[PDB]
RNA sequence: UUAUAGUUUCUUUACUUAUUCAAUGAAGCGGAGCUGGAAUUCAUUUUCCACGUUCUAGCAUUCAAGGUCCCAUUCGGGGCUG
RNA sequence: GAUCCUAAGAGAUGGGGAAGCUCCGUUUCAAAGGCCUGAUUUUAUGCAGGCCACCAUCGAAAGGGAAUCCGGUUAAGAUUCC
């Protein structure tokens, strides 16, 4: 299962890989709306651990709250 | 590749197929009957001595019409019911909060003939 | 001819209101088009880590063509072909009572991510095709490194759509040939050697080297001007 | 809106848009400058032809 | 204590500009291809008044290079500009009064006006009556030209920043006394609601930091700090000095 | 002593791509090529050197000229230049 | 007269703020529908001549504004009834 390799990789957030991906995705998300939709989960292993399934009815929604 | 010429510096929403509504079930399925029919339009006549003076003299019929009734619908109602050609219809709403209409007929029909036909004198 | 006279147009500054020419470079594109482009450019401009950059080197279009020609066979059973095979099997469960010996062993392509990951971990895979355009790359960033460590021959092939069309899905993000017919083992062996030349062998070197850090064409031309300034004076 | 064109338009060039003095003054302006643009055309063409034909006296 | 006149001016309810009787936004026509590479000719179609502003506006009809129109633009008439005369806007345009050329494409010592701070601004500096910039210096190396502003301050603007040649018309407007209150009243009535100013000292101490006392007096220093909070500034903000000087300012 | 290029360790500059401020109804941006007229080292594979509108309160909008295939040569509509 | 238009302005929309009641802004960092000619006569539907676009709505019974006058008439209406 790729899900274990995803779960392990996603924890190392300052690994050269996730550093790059954080920088490019945070740009993609900031350019879209505040509360916009998501065609699929960005983290399909995190989603399904919280109870997401890949059947009709389940949705994902990306949302950005101001910090501070 | 070889992407199409665009003389416009603006992109606008491409036109797409506005599809017609085709419901699986009728909304009501039994349509309503005519709300204001002839008899709902023309409710009563007005038997006040002033209304009678105008019926005898002017060749006019003072009829108590509904609210939500067009001058067109009063003309059409009087013609269909009483069998008479209406020259004009002048409508005011009374201080009583009911409508009344001065149905003047063409020269062909004397209003007394149709007043006596209805019953009231 | 005798009554029609040739004229200048004269599209200078003043004369002749400019003609409706191509403004396809200057179109105020929708924000979704503007964003999918600006993301593609920005992903190249920033320094790409060497484990992400290894997906830029996709398999060339003749080795790919031959890989897909072998992978065209062992296509997973269709909905019709499945139904008919089940009708023969389930009928033979009554007529003869000979089940699980009828319907001869299937040679199909193995696909789905969590399936093939486990086939590589158990070292049953003989060729693994890894897509280069998976929506969250992280799903696949680990797969060449796992595939090498286990010592399965793997190739980064162009198109998850192309893989999807091969497995009767829309996208597959991964494919794997774990078995083969005796006839077609020779082709697999050759194509495995030619893809090992590109990906497997060079993994240890490509592991070191970064992608991206590439300027836009206007800043490229400016640097080439500012470099010819000092040295090429 | 329901009046004849006669009532609100004199039969001339611009008629019910400009005066008879304003229209004649822009006729004389239009034609004159069209003849000073055709004399410019040749004066500049002969200043080109002069500079071309006499430039090659020097390289010799 | 109350919120001071000064404090509640910025809320902008009644204190907003009286903007009905005005012609429009007085700008230079946008920095475009024709102005960059050549110049466009425009005709001063009419020279009009503008309320709350003591300098005539030159409505100058230009053409549209791309479609069949006459894009009319509202300028601030330089002095000596007249009706029907041709204004020339661009890099290659000649150095005559009314013409709009970038400061880089101009010699030193020129008297320019309606200058851009940034290139593509469409006018910012020397826009008021009888005022102008003097282009002091230049530098094509890091193309930025030195200019002297009506305040007497030296700035450094880009060489692509445009400006109209000559002084802005209506000069000497301030040198006549306004006269008897009503003249001021009528002047202000078409700009803003900043007129007959009450003295903070003549108010009660609620209303202003100057109020109160059995005599009208400020009581403490009128020179207030720059770091004084939005509500405390009444008198002279960050006063480098005070008093009437001797000889020259 | 420095000759590995294995981190900013601190300070002097630079790069765009994040961030930022504008403007346009996102038209002409950047590089190169023509024509330059020429640079003279000498007519060039060498590098400096512009790119259709100005006396005048007019006008400038529906692709015209050449060229090429179709319209069986009616009607014209189309390729590339311009 | 109202109905229509816009004025100082009030205000949805896109969006962005706010724990939220809702606040900002009204042309904005939006893919923001309408106009006409015949078509072709498939119990009337597919064309194209093609064009055109910084864009709700509310806001005046004194501002802008399509068009009525005379005579007579009733206990009480009339620039309306005759």
C124 touches C171 (CB < 8 A)? no
Residues 53-92 of C with CB under 7 A from strand F: none
C177 touches C71 (CB < 8 A)? yes
| A23·C51 Cβ contact <8 A | no
Q: What was the experiment behind these coordinates?
A: cryo-EM
Token output for D47: 């200043």
Sign of CA dihedral E159, E162, E163, E164: positive
Q: Minimal CA–CA distance to E91: which of E144, E34, E168?
A: E34
E207 touches E4 (CB < 8 A)? yes
Burial of A14 (0-12, 13-18, 19+ CB in 10 A): exposed
Token output for E23: 């012609």
For residue E33, give the chain C residue with the closest CA.
C13
Cα three-residue angle C150-C155-C161, rounded to 5 degrees? 125
Q: What three-state secondary structure class fits C112?
A: coil
Sign of CA dihedral E210, E216, E220, E221: positive
E117 touches E124 (CB < 8 A)? yes
Give the DSSP H/E element, type plus range, for residue C226: helix C217-230
Do A and B make contact via 3 or more CB pairs under 8 A? The reply is no
CA distances to C100, E168, E238 from C92, rounded to whole Å, are 10, 104, 102
B3 touches C24 (CB < 8 A)? yes
Q: What φ, ψ does residue B60 adopt, rounded to 5°?
A: -130, 150
Sign of CA dihedral C112, C113, C119, C123: positive
E59 touches E46 (CB < 8 A)? yes
Q: What three-state secondary structure class fits E171?
A: coil
Q: What φ, ψ does residue A9 adopt, rounded to 5°?
A: -60, -45
CA within 13 Å, CB half, E117? 3
CA C223 to chain centroid: 33
Q: Label the pairing between strands C154-157 and C127-131.
A: parallel
Nearest nucleotide from residue D28 CA, by C1' atom: F58
User: For this experimental structure, what is the resolution in angstroms?
Assistant: 2.9
Q: What three-state secondary structure class fits E192?
A: coil
Nearest nucleotide from residue C18 CA, by C1' atom: F27
Q: Backbone breaks in chain E (C–N > 2.5 Å) follow which residues?
A: none
Token output for C153: 């021959």
CB pairs under 8 A between A and C: 60
Cα three-residue angle E227-E228-E231, rounded to 5 degrees? 140
How far does chain E reach from its first CA to its final CA, in angstroms? Answer: 39
Number of H helices, E strands in chain E: 3, 12
D13 touches D27 (CB < 8 A)? yes
Other CB atoms within 10 A of residue E32 CB: 14
Instruction: Give the distance from residue B12's alpha carbon to the nearest chain C alpha carbon, in angstroms.
Output: 9
E176 touches E187 (CB < 8 A)? no
Token output for A66: 């101001």
Is the shortest CB-to-strand distance from B9 to strand F under 7 Å? yes
Other CB atoms within 10 A of residue E189 CB: 13
Distance CA(E239)–CA(E216), nearest Å, equals 22
C131 touches C174 (CB < 8 A)? yes
Q: What φ, ψ does residue C217 adopt, rounded to 5°?
A: -60, -30
Q: What three-state secondary structure class fits E182?
A: helix
Burial of C111 (0-12, 13-18, 19+ CB in 10 A): buried
SS3 content of chain C, % helix, strand, coil (to 5): 45, 10, 45
Angstrom distance, A24 CA to F7 C1': 25
Count how many residues are written for chain A: 68
Distance CA(E83)–CA(E44), nearest Å, equals 5
Residues 48-87 of E with CB under 7 A from strand F: 63-69, 83-86
Q: What three-state secondary structure class fits C67?
A: helix
Count how many residues are written for chain E: 249
Nearest to C28 among B4, B7, B11 (CB): B11
Q: Minimal CA–CA distance to E125: which of E249, E19, E28?
A: E28
Q: What φ, ψ does residue A37 adopt, rounded to 5°?
A: -80, 175
């Amino acid at each position: 299962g790729a899900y274990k390799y995803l779960e392990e990789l996603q924890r190392k957030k300052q690994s050269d890989v996730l550093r790059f991906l954080q920088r490019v995705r945070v740009w993609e998300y900031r350019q879209k709306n505040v509360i916009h939709r998501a065609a699929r989960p960005t983290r399909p292993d995190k989603a399904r651990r919280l109870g997401y399934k890949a059947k009709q009815g389940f949705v994902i929604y990306r949302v950005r709250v101001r910090r501070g | 590749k070889a992407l199409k010429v665009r003389t416009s510096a603006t992109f606008r929403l491409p036109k797409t197929l506005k599809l017609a509504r085709a419901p699986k079930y009728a909304s009501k399925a039994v349509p309503h009957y005519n709300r204001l029919d002839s008899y709902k339009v023309i409710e009563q006549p007005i038997t006040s001595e002033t209304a009678m003076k105008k019926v005898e003299d002017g060749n006019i019929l003072v009829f108590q019409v509904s609210m939500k009734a067009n001058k067109y619908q009063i003309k059409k109602a009087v013609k269909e019911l009483y069998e008479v050609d209406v020259l004009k219809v002048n409508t005011l709403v009374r201080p009583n909060g009911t409508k009344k209409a001065y149905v003047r007929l063409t020269a062909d029909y004397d209003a007394l003939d149709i007043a006596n036909r209805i019953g009231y004198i | 001819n005798p009554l029609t006279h040739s004229t200048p147009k004269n599209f200078g500054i003043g004369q002749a209101v400019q003609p409706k020419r191509n403004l396809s470079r200057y179109v105020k594109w929708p924000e979704y088009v503007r964003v999918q482009r600006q993301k593609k450019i920005l992903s190249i401009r920033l320094k790409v880590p060497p484990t992400i950059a290894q997906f830029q080197y996709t398999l060339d279009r003749n080795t790919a063509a031959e890989t897909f020609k072998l992978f065209n066979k062992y296509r997973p059973e269709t909905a019709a072909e499945k139904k008919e095979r089940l009708t023969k099997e389930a009928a033979a469960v009554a007529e003869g009572k000979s089940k699980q010996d009828a319907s001869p062993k299937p040679y199909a392509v193995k696909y789905g991510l969590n399936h093939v990951v486990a086939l590589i971990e158990n070292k049953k895979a003989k060729l693994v095709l890894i897509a280069n355009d998976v929506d969250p790359i992280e799903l696949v960033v680990f797969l060449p490194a796992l595939c090498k460590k286990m010592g399965v021959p793997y190739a980064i092939v162009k198109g998850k759509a192309r893989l999807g069309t091969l497995v009767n899905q829309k996208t597959s993000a991964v494919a794997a040939l774990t078995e083969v017919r005796a006839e077609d083992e020779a082709a697999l062996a050759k194509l495995v050697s030619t893809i090992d030349a590109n990906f497997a062998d060079k993994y240890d070197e490509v592991k070191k080297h970064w992608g991206g850090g590439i300027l836009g064409n206007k800043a490229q031309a400016k640097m080439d001007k500012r470099a010819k300034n000092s040295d090429s004076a | 809106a329901t009046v004849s064109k006669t009532h609100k338009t004199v039969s001339r060039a611009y008629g019910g848009s400009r005066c008879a003095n304003c229209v004649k003054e822009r006729i004389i302006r239009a034609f004159l400058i069209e003849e000073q643009k055709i004399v410019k055309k040749v004066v500049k063409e002969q200043t080109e032809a002069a500079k071309k034909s006499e430039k090659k006296a020097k390289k010799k | 204590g109350r919120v001071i006149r000064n404090q509640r001016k910025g809320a902008g309810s009644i204190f907003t500009s009286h903007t009905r009787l005005r012609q429009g936004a007085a700008k230079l026509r946008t920095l475009d291809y024709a102005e960059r590479h050549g110049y466009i000719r425009g005709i001063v179609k009419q020279i009009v008044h503008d309320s709350g502003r003591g300098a005539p506006l030159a409505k100058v009809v230009f053409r549209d290079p791309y479609k069949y129109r006459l894009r009319e633009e509202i300028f601030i008439a330089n002095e000596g500009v007249h009706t029907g005369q041709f204004i020339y806007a661009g890099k290659k345009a000649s150095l005559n009064v009314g013409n709009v050329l970038p400061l880089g494409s101009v010699p030193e010592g020129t008297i320019v006006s309606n200058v851009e701070e940034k290139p593509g601004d469409r006018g910012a500096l020397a826009r008021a009556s009888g005022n102008y910039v003097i282009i002091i210096g230049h530098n094509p190396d890091e193309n930025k030209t030195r200019v002297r502003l009506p305040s007497g301050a030296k700035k450094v603007i880009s060489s692509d920043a445009r400006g109209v040649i000559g002084v802005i018309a209506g000069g000497g407007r301030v040198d006549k006394p306004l006269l008897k209150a009503g003249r001021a009243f009528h002047k202000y009535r078409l700009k803003r609601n900043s007129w007959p100013k009450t003295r903070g000292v003549a108010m009660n101490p609620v209303d202003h930091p100057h109020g109160g006392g059995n005599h009208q007096h400020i009581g403490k220093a009128s020179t207030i700090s720059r770091g004084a909070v939005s509500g405390q500034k009444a008198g002279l903000i960050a006063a480098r000095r005070t008093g009437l000087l001797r000889g020259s300012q």
